[PDB]
Protein backbone atom coordinates (compact mmCIF):
# COMPACT_ATOMS: atom_id res chain seq x y z
CA UNK A 1 0.00 0.00 0.00
CA UNK A 2 1.07 3.59 -0.53
CA UNK A 3 1.29 5.75 2.60
CA UNK A 4 1.80 9.48 3.06
CA UNK A 5 3.79 11.37 5.68
CA UNK A 6 3.12 15.00 6.47
CA UNK A 7 5.98 16.71 8.29
CA UNK A 8 5.40 19.79 10.36
CA UNK A 9 8.88 20.18 11.77
CA UNK A 10 10.53 23.36 12.98
CA UNK A 11 12.92 23.22 10.02
CA UNK A 12 11.52 20.62 7.64
CA UNK A 13 7.93 20.78 6.44
CA UNK A 14 6.12 19.01 3.64
CA UNK A 15 4.96 15.63 2.37
CA UNK A 16 6.61 12.33 1.36
CA UNK A 17 5.31 8.86 0.50
CA UNK A 18 6.43 5.24 0.88
CA UNK A 19 5.13 1.79 -0.08
CA UNK A 20 4.78 -0.80 2.69
CA UNK A 21 2.87 -4.01 3.41
CA UNK A 22 1.03 -2.51 6.38
CA UNK A 23 0.84 0.56 8.59
CA UNK A 24 3.23 -0.72 11.30
CA UNK A 25 5.82 -1.22 8.59
CA UNK A 26 5.23 2.20 7.05
CA UNK A 27 5.47 3.74 10.49
CA UNK A 28 8.98 2.34 10.98
CA UNK A 29 10.06 3.57 7.55
CA UNK A 30 8.70 7.06 8.23
CA UNK A 31 10.13 7.28 11.72
CA UNK A 32 13.54 6.51 10.21
CA UNK A 33 12.95 9.14 7.50
CA UNK A 34 12.08 11.73 10.17
CA UNK A 35 15.06 10.82 12.29
CA UNK A 36 17.45 10.89 9.33
CA UNK A 37 16.17 14.36 8.51
CA UNK A 38 16.55 15.69 12.04
CA UNK A 39 12.86 15.68 13.06
CA UNK A 40 11.71 14.47 16.47
CA UNK A 41 8.08 15.09 17.24
CA UNK A 42 4.59 13.84 17.94
CA UNK A 43 2.90 11.35 15.59
CA UNK A 44 -0.51 10.53 14.25
CA UNK A 45 -1.76 7.88 11.84
CA UNK A 46 -5.12 8.05 10.09
CA UNK A 47 -5.98 4.83 8.42
CA UNK A 48 -8.84 6.44 6.49
CA UNK A 49 -6.33 8.39 4.39
CA UNK A 50 -3.21 6.22 4.86
CA UNK A 51 -1.52 9.31 6.29
CA UNK A 52 0.96 9.76 9.08
CA UNK A 53 1.89 13.12 10.54
CA UNK A 54 4.88 14.19 12.60
CA UNK A 55 4.77 17.57 14.36
CA UNK A 56 7.38 19.43 16.37
From Swiss-Prot:
It is found in: Secreted, Cell wall. Sequence repeats lie at residues 2-56. It comes from the Bacteria. This is Immunoglobulin G-binding protein G. The chain holds residues 302 to 357 of 593 of the full protein.
